[PDB]
């Protein structure tokens, strides 16, 4: 039991699991997030270090006004041939009747090079998979979504030659596949193992409900017939499980002989008075990604541990790989481009939203656009990765109007979020406000404003995160911290609180500015700590 | 002689009117519709025809993703210089705290010439006008967007100077008024007339508190001084009044030296089992724009005939010019490019969406996305400018799967519309569906499937349009028709029906294809007619 899950904490969901010789990769989704798609790369499965994110141009992903929970949803990464290959969808819309979203292919010798212009694969739904048959022949996979009012919304699994030739799906599509009373069947991923086709699924949605399936078929196009215990992954019937939200898997045969299975999960904070058979709870770091063990018997696979996962598993017998991290605790802005943790919203980070060598050692984000906005936000976040942590920046900021405002925010969408900035107000000059925006409800709690000397170069900021509550401090030298009485609940910043139709990422921190004058005014943050704490 | 109110029937709010010679224009806002920006022409102000769309290329406007009602709102035509000069928005976020939007400059030498691309003025609120001082300083006004908790969000009326040489505006703004008890401030226009600064703004929201206020200052800069019996335009007062939601008023003084006012207006279909007095009514022709006729006294203008306005208005002494239709009733789509009354979704009409050239005498679509998407739709569409008339095409569209459908649509925004489509079934073949989306919730009410044989060449689609209900028809030989037995309420297509920030349009009705299965198959529309009754 040397594997302890989850292996990606914080938002890291639909993870895609591939082996390359003695190398293991997983691809997680990224929805609205720049750039897109992230990969892990692992030697053992018990260590993980963030190894590339392939989305990088606009010509691969442009999501400038997508939808929140929109973009980027779960990849399929694949190696082939000499190459990798990762297909990938972009979300246009997340609520109603209708899916709008389209799949692409791109390719790369290595996870951390360039990869390819996207070739544009179908619409018809969404968790598009590729599948390298052992005849050479290529398959892509992925969910129908049906609008039409009197039908269940996932029509089933799609199947249709990918032609390597002519860089098109080829011949016409067949629904191999539709599911079992779980429904919500999609993240269709195929194997052939021993004499059988294994078709592995998602089903019940990707809240409580989830689960993985799976069925085999000697043929691919099928019949293909359900595992005899299904569903093979799912913590349904467990709400006190520690791991919940199981499903969306993908499997691993190791350079071992071993048979893995990764999956998302959730972790929720539960609230006391209520019951968590009812309420299950929420999740502020969203979906997570764990890895299990898989036996076989008569030809199908199961869970060692029972279906509902367990938290630590025996690893493969394999040597131990540890890796150096990939960010540091303390970022001093010292180097000339933004650390892999970093992202931004929908668009690359360029010099029209922020610069690391105009102000030297400083990370300088020129004021855009406001946090509601799905269009051009100067904010770089980082992921929530632990109940319990604290992250703090210090922020040269002299704003000029009401309208210009900076500092650190904690982020689920752009209805979601609380905000400690640096702003102006006509009669007192520089201050320090708090707003809180929650499904759009916008508030600014403080009862007496925060005056800001003119003496004050750097403005300090913090927020200490403590599972259940966050709250903010703020010093005006370092040294000494005033702590904001303001409680502030992490269950608001959690896929479970939100509203709409796209609830699929998790609570980041970061660095803003916002200029709604018009004169981009620039806010220069000296660093950036991310610590997790005990 | 007589104006007939409204001038500019269906959705064409925000009027702008400008005088250059003895030419009047007024331009209106687009909001998610492309090309952005209308600019109507008239000789006597009576007779007005559609003269240009600005705002054609993506460098100018660009708008995939922009909310429902987004876009560009109020712009502001004037004339100095030898050129004009056009201030317009793209907002980008309708709902909120925040209200992110950008104001832009373009200008030509003539409404339909090319126009420059956009100098960037400002962000700080929506409305931008363009002032121009006897003295030759230029200045841009706008409304300030105030976000703060405790704060009304309509701070003002800001002031700044705009260099022309150095393409930006300089010094500091300067909030110059900050409006009435009858608040929601904006939509500011700047006059010099005789002895005063003239401030125009529009107050109490674009829906039936709306209302005009004008006041004057010796001074540019303020303090102004509000008229004796402002409002100057309103119908707050007469629920009955054939014209409601009267504001957002610019002046213009005629070369015949009188003196009138635009402002846009919405006129409602009432419901009978309602008070008047408390639903005031829904409006499927969003809203229009009438002219009023100003007099003056002691320094003040008035409405003519009182501030809700009137429907018929003295016309000024001018020559009447009348002006020959602008669109053909029945578009056969021989020409190569599209006619000006059509209009799509946010995005240039691109060979990507559909051709004029690909299948001639049709206008092909390309399957693209639903109706529910603000991204990338084939949809092209013309405003109902009429509460009676019939629209009708011819569809040859041969579907594989259930993803993909074509026909004819009346829509309002991404989550209000009613569909009528050629599409295919599983079982059944090419079908024939009605498809209904009432905020976003989606229906497909009829009983039983229409069955399309494959004998049939073209499906022939109708809506016909009687006030408060429309229905469609469709025909398989053009000869038969057959009525599809579910009336429609117009009122779903108003402005006071759809939820949300962003109910600035009105309702349309055109040619629409999708493939939400990835193949873009094309479907090529025969002809568009468009024919209104008179009652």
């Known amino acids: 039991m040397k594997i302890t899950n989850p292996v990606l904490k914080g938002f890291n969901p639909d993870p895609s699991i591939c082996r390359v010789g003695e190398d293991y990769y997983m691809a997680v989704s990224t929805f609205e997030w720049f750039p897109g798609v992230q990969i892990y790369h692992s030697k053992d499965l018990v260590h993980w270090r963030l190894a590339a994110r392939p989305l990088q141009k606009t010509s691969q992903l442009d999501m400038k006004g997508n939808p929140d929970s929109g973009g980027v949803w779960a990849p399929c990464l694949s190696y082939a041939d000499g190459q990798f290959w990762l297909i990938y969808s972009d979300i246009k819309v997340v609520d109603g009747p209708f899916k709008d979203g389209?799949?692409?292919?791109?390719?790369?010798?290595?996870?951390?090079?360039?990869?390819?212009?996207?070739?544009?694969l179908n619409s018809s739904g969404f968790d598009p998979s590729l599948f390298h048959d052992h005849s050479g022949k290529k398959y892509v996979?992925?969910?129908?979504?049906?609008?039409?009012?009197?039908?269940?919304?996932?029509?089933?699994?799609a199947l249709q030659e990918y032609s390597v030739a002519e860089k098109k799906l080829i011949g016409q599509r067949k629904v191999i596949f539709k599911g079992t009373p779980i429904k919500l069947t999609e993240?269709?991923?195929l194997y052939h193992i021993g004499d059988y086709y294994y078709l592995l699924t998602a089903e019940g949605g990707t809240r409580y409900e989830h689960a993985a399936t799976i069925a085999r078929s000697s043929h691919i196009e099928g019949p293909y017939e359900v595992h005899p215990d299904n569903p093979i992954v799912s913590a349904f019937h467990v709400p006190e499980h520690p791991l919940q939200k199981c499903g969306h898997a993908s499997i691993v045969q190791?350079?071992?002989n071993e048979w893995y299975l990764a999956h998302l999960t959730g972790r929720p904070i539960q609230s006391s008075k209520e019951s968590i058979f009812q309420q299950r709870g929420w999740c502020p770091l969203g979906r997570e990604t764990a890895i299990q063990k898989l036996e076989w018997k008569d030809g199908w696979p199961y869970v060692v541990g029972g279906k509902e996962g367990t938290l630590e598993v025996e690893a493969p017998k394999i040597e131990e790989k540890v890796f150096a991290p990939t960010y540091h605790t303390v970022d001093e802005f010292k180097e000339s481009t933004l650390n892999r943790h970093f992202q931004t919203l929908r668009i690359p980070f360029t010099d029209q939203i922020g610069s690391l060598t105009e102000k030297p050692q400083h990370l300088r984000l020129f004021g855009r656009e406001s946090l509601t906005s799905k269009f051009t936000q100067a904010f770089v976040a980082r992921r929530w990765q632990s109940f319990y942590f604290?992250?703090?920046?210090?922020?040269?900021?002299?704003?000029?109007?009401?309208q210009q405002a900076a500092g650190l925010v904690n982020y689920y969408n752009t209805e979601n979020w609380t905000a400690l900035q640096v702003t102006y107000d006509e009669e007192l000059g520089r201050t320090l406000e708090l707003s809180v925006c929650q499904n759009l409800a916008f508030s600014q709690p403080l009862t007496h404003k925060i005056i800001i000397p003119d003496e004050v170069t750097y403005v300090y900021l913090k927020v200490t995160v403590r599972k259940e509550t966050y709250k903010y401090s703020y010093s005006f030298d370092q040294k000494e911290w005033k702590e904001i009485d303001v409680p502030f609940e992490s269950i608001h910043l959690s896929d479970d609180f939100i509203r709409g139709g796209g609830f699929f990422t998790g609570a980041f921190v970061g660095m803003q500015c916002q200029d709604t004058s018009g004169e981009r005014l620039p806010a220069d943050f000296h660093y950036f700590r991310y610590e997790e704490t005990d």
């Not at 389209?102 to 544009?120: F, K, M, Q, R």
């Not at 996979?141 to 699994?157: P, Q, T, V």
């Not at 604290?390 to 009401?402: G, K, L, Q």
């Open 102 to 120: 389209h799949n692409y292919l791109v390719t790369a010798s290595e996870v951390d090079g360039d990869w390819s212009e996207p070739i544009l």
């Open 141 to 157: 996979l992925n969910m129908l979504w049906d609008h039409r009012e009197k039908h269940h919304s996932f029509a089933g699994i």
């Open 187 to 189: 993240a269709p991923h």
């Open 254 to 256: 190791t350079h071992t």
């Open 390 to 402: 604290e992250a703090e920046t210090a922020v040269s900021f002299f704003p000029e109007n009401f």
